[PDB]
Amino acid sequence: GAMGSMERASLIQKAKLAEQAERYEDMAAFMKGAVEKGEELSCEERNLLSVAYKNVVGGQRAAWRVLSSIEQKSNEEGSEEKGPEVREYREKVETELQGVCDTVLGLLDSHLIKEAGDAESRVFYLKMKGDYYRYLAEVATGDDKKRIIDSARSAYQEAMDISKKEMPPTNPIRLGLALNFSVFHYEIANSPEEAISLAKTTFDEAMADLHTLSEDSYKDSTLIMQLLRDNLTLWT
């Protein structure tokens, strides 16, 4: 699209500048342009893609939750009728959020996943597919809600299967995948016991492998392990 005339390397350079400037919409547009060049992404480039879209969708999710709460309060007993505006604006934000999720899922399907042969890249992209279906599931209410949930589940499960076969239990991608799949279980799938079991097992298997790691790898892994612990504390 609009980035078709810009060099791949220039898009990557500008994505890093956009990150420093906290211009995440720009960062995401630059990374989309880089993906559309058709070459596979390096580890650093995959992280730029993830950071960009996580920040964009994060703003939308936070806004959606604010508006949904106001809407829900408006439909209580004794609440004064104030017209269609809250629903309309919630719908506007929701549609924009769904558009971002669809964009990410489109990049993954055309053609990031099919070209990803190394475990690290394949698991990364399948985790992303699970995440963006999960964000769609957060706002889904219609006929397709069950199918959206199953799409998230399926992507996470494929990623889990590869990660268990091909990666050590302390690998940060493996850890972040398991963390997010446990959140899926708790928040989306109405399966708090599965969420807790996964978080516990993941934490414990990582603990037992820390002894193999350098100081820097230890820091990376323990950061994500703390998030598992934080959830376990909240959930139990």
């Binding site: 993830s50 996580k54 994060g58 995440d131 850890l175 963390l179 708790y186 998030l227 959830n231 909240l234």
Partner: peptide
């Protein structure tokens, strides 16, 4: 308020 990864500031 569950924690996921990555996260924003």
């Amino acid at each position: 308020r569950s924690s996921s990864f990555p996260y924003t500031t």
